[PDB]
Design an enzyme around this catalytic site. Structure first.
Site, PDB file in Angstrom:
ATOM      1  N   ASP A  83       0.820  -1.214   0.000  1.00 20.24           N
ATOM      2  CA  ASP A  83       0.000   0.000   0.000  1.00 20.24           C
ATOM      3  C   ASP A  83       0.858   1.270   0.000  1.00 20.24           C
ATOM      4  O   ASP A  83       2.080   1.200   0.121  1.00 20.24           O
ATOM      5  CB  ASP A  83      -1.003  -0.013   1.159  1.00 20.24           C
ATOM      6  N   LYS A  84       0.207   2.416  -0.193  1.00 26.67           N
ATOM      7  CA  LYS A  84       0.848   3.715  -0.108  1.00 26.67           C
ATOM      8  C   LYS A  84       0.040   4.566   0.867  1.00 26.67           C
ATOM      9  O   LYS A  84      -1.188   4.489   0.908  1.00 26.67           O
ATOM     10  CB  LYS A  84       0.893   4.402  -1.496  1.00 26.67           C
ATOM     11  N   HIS A  85       0.733   5.395   1.635  1.00 27.67           N
ATOM     12  CA  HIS A  85       0.054   6.401   2.432  1.00 27.67           C
ATOM     13  C   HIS A  85       0.783   7.731   2.317  1.00 27.67           C
ATOM     14  O   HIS A  85       2.015   7.790   2.253  1.00 27.67           O
ATOM     15  CB  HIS A  85      -0.073   5.963   3.899  1.00 27.67           C
ATOM     16  N   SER A  86       0.003   8.796   2.314  1.00 27.03           N
ATOM     17  CA  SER A  86       0.521  10.118   2.152  1.00 27.03           C
ATOM     18  C   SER A  86       0.102  10.952   3.349  1.00 27.03           C
ATOM     19  O   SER A  86      -0.921  10.682   3.965  1.00 27.03           O
ATOM     20  CB  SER A  86      -0.045  10.700   0.853  1.00 27.03           C
ATOM     21  N   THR A 123      -8.797  11.118  -0.828  1.00 27.87           N
ATOM     22  CA  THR A 123      -8.986  10.200  -1.939  1.00 27.87           C
ATOM     23  C   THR A 123     -10.455   9.727  -2.061  1.00 27.87           C
ATOM     24  O   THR A 123     -11.028   9.714  -3.162  1.00 27.87           O
ATOM     25  CB  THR A 123      -7.999   9.030  -1.821  1.00 27.87           C
ATOM     26  N   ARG A 171      -5.910  14.560  21.533  1.00 21.92           N
ATOM     27  CA  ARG A 171      -4.748  15.324  21.035  1.00 21.92           C
ATOM     28  C   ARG A 171      -5.129  16.642  20.353  1.00 21.92           C
ATOM     29  O   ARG A 171      -4.496  17.688  20.589  1.00 21.92           O
ATOM     30  CB  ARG A 171      -3.915  14.466  20.071  1.00 21.92           C
ATOM     31  N   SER A 186      -0.415   7.096  15.001  1.00 19.63           N
ATOM     32  CA  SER A 186      -1.659   7.495  14.350  1.00 19.63           C
ATOM     33  C   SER A 186      -1.683   7.207  12.824  1.00 19.63           C
ATOM     34  O   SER A 186      -2.689   6.714  12.295  1.00 19.63           O
ATOM     35  CB  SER A 186      -1.920   8.975  14.649  1.00 19.63           C
ATOM     36  N   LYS A 190      -3.576   2.395  11.322  1.00 21.51           N
ATOM     37  CA  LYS A 190      -4.605   2.123  10.317  1.00 21.51           C
ATOM     38  C   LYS A 190      -4.041   1.313   9.155  1.00 21.51           C
ATOM     39  O   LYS A 190      -4.668   0.345   8.702  1.00 21.51           O
ATOM     40  CB  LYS A 190      -5.218   3.429   9.802  1.00 21.51           C
ATOM     41  N   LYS A 191      -2.847   1.700   8.697  1.00 22.61           N
ATOM     42  CA  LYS A 191      -2.251   1.116   7.501  1.00 22.61           C
ATOM     43  C   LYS A 191      -1.739  -0.296   7.721  1.00 22.61           C
ATOM     44  O   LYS A 191      -1.858  -1.138   6.836  1.00 22.61           O
ATOM     45  CB  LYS A 191      -1.149   2.010   6.921  1.00 22.61           C
TER      46      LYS A 191
END
Lengths: 440, 440
Positions: A83-86, A123, A171, A186, A190-191
């Site tokens: 996967d990718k996360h930004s 997204t 937070r 954080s 999730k990822k």
């Protein structure tokens, strides 16, 4: 007096917490057995005293094991789960092309994404510009798509690293967002619950980014890399430019259009291409679909240039109840704004700087993003034909084309755009779109 | 479009390049309008032909001018902007005392550092062992601090001399690192970007130094002095000893602790005292804050004796969001290792030599630095009470006290330390801490 406020005292006095203490606390955040005050007190101790590697890992793994962790071994896939996360940006459309591109090269890409946050688009909100597109499939439906198409882009259920809900919410009212180990947990919880073999991170740099400065963005990137590999998920990160809109467009439908045109080859923004291709290269190396850059890039370019990546995107959209012919006929399906016209600068210089947070904010105010649960996105608003840092600008070179609901909206966005782009007499220095690659 | 093959050719054929050709090429490196082959070719022609003073000067000014150069003219400061730069070493904590000491004597010291990787640790890592301490203030806060406190130690290095990135990267794969005008531009550009009126360069001599021979250290030091003064910055250099650990400690929290105790008078390692003092002296003289050596030392000794230099370090810490009572209560704030314990030699004798790189590596293996840029630092581990060359060793006199995170890493560190230190039946001869002062 139900339990150990003792964990807070320990970190307050600069002592390292232990795996069990962290699991204990994260579990209690989910169960509501630990109050808002207690969470906020622990956050603040972490802000002041920075967590060690074993603490960082234990924090993320704890947050990941707080909900459901996806297991893919049941299906015998014969391809990596990648996967990718930004960290987010303006015109940051990369995923729409990237998932398909990677799927096209043997990758399996369960992209659980999110919606818009603050100035950044999301997204999911982009994809929901597509009529019929369903971002909430069942566990069963999800597996099928991933198994058949090789990629899907979906929203999170309550059961996905749910500790983060209370944790982040606390937070965000306690001035405890700005701490690297807490951001890392954080981001990654999730990822990692997606049950990945591999992951690339896209950490943005500049005016439209999460972190204020390059060095901080860099710091966050290494921390994510450290933690993720620590959790047993091969990970790299890239530091990418976000001192301007990445795509030539910002918003929802407009960005979806741009993604489709890039995959077919109709148009490819050269900056958006560099960033997309590089992020793609990482997933292939880490996923063991390629051994180096060159071999990754030839497989990636090939699927951009033989129509395979476009095809997979069409099939994905169809798999998720979007139209069967979306790629072929997208402009029949994407919604159009009532009002579209260029905005022009008041000066004749070169584009020197671009305030990207403010551009992102401007897209929100037009309706391209929510601010309250109930308010519903107009999917057609936004910018296209973005001028770029370094371009010579005059009376027939517009800064952008603004798509709006009405004149008043349009004028508001027009002034915001004009305010956000600054012009110099001499050309500014070029900046690379990709700054650095980071490995374990 | 604007290849510089003519520039390469001119240099290849043994001609001096003009300031304008040099600036054009460097700015072309920054903007990536010049290709790696071309950078490499020019690097090689320079390796072969060397550079005259005019060229050396143009080269480093162009690298300096390639990014931000800080302007102090507003703010109306009534003293000199001054800094120290070093080739680095194990237990070289000097900057932590030198900044406060010089600023207490009237200087302004905008200490911007790069991130430490390799056998020797970084100044920035050390300060970040102080909870709250922020190495990344925004440039407007930065100038406030320099104005109010007189010294600040930050990390915003990215926008400084960015042309050096591609240059060095290229140099480092084509065997064109080892060239004195290239080394000199690289060493000096970021530091001159601070807008200095004055500068001292610490060039290490010994087994632990960046340059391998006394003669080569001296050669580098003279080149740096020639160029910096040509660049209009009043600079001298010192050769100082690195045949052993400079401070009595190596690590992060342990070295901050030593820095505070040195400023307050609780402990002053005599070797570290000599180096620190000599460096500060140059800064005062080049900065025009002292007439000569004796006046300078009187001024420095006085800020050490009356607590003013320690107070400045305290005010710097508070300015950078650390606790405001850090000097009084440093033991309360500095992270403490789980296990701290003396390591004794397997043999009896005199300490004859020490492998400083191996010692630095032992700290890194403890978690006290980065094996890779991915890694997270455990700020609490390291060595204290370091034995020194010529010390008599037996079962009552330890080699060091090792601060480790657990017994297994302690054991690991204890082997490494024992292997790094060479004992002998007969005592060795002593050497100075401080060698030649170079003014050229």
């Amino acid at each position: 007096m139900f339990l150990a406020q003792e964990i807070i005292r320990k970190k307050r006095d600069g002592h390292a917490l232990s795996d069990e203490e962290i699991r204990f606390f994260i579990n209690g955040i989910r169960d509501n057995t630990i109050s808002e005050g207690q969470i906020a007190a622990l956050a603040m101790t972490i802000f002041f005293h920075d967590m060690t590697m074993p603490e960082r890992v234990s924090l993320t793994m704890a947050m990941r094991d707080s909900g459901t962790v996806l297991d893919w071994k049941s299906l015998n896939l014969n391809g990596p789960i990648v996967d990718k996360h930004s960290t987010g940006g303006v015109g940051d459309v990369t995923s729409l092309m990237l998932g398909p591109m990677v799927a096209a090269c043997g990758g399996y890409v369960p992209m659980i994404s999110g919606r818009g946050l603050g100035h950044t688009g999301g997204t999911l909100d982009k994809l929901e510009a597509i009529p019929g597109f369903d971002i909430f499939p069942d566990d069963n439906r999800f597996r099928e798509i991933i198994q058949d198409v090789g990629v899907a882009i979906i929203g999170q259920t309550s059961s996905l690293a749910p500790a983060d809900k209370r944790f982040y919410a606390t937070r965000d009212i306690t001035a405890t967002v700005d701490s690297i180990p807490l951001i890392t947990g954080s981001i990654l919880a999730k990822k990692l619950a997606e049950g990945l073999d591999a992951l690339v991170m896209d950490v943005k740099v500049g005016s439209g980014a999460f972190m204020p400065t390059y060095e901080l963005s860099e710091a966050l990137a290494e921390a994510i890399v450290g933690v993720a590999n620590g959790a047993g998920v091969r990970t790299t990160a890239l530091l990418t430019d976000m001192n301007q809109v990445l795509a030539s467009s910002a918003g929802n439908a407009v960005e979806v259009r741009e993604a489709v045109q890039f995959l077919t080859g109709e148009y490819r923004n050269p900056r958006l291409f560099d960033v997309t291709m590089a992020l793609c290269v990482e997933m292939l190396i880490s996923g063991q679909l390629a051994k180096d850059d060159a071999e990754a890039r030839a497989k990636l370019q090939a699927v951009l240039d033989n129509g395979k990546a476009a095809e997979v995107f069409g099939r994905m959209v169809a798999a998720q109840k979007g139209p069967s012919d979306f790629v072929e006929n997208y402009d029949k399906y994407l919604p159009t704004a009532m009002l579209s016209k260029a905005v022009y600068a008041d000066t004749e210089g070169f584009i020197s700087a671009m305030d990207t947070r403010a551009l992102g904010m401007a897209v929100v105010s037009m309706g391209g993003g929510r601010r309250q649960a109930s308010d519903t996105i107009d999917y057609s608003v936004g910018f296209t034909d973005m001028a770029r840092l370094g371009d010579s600008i005059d009376g027939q070179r517009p800064l952008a084309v603004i798509h709006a609901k009405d004149e008043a909206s349009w004028q508001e966005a027009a002034k915001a755009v004009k305010a956000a782009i600054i012009l110099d007499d001499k050309a500014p220095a070029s900046t690379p779109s990709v700054y650095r690659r980071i490995t374990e």
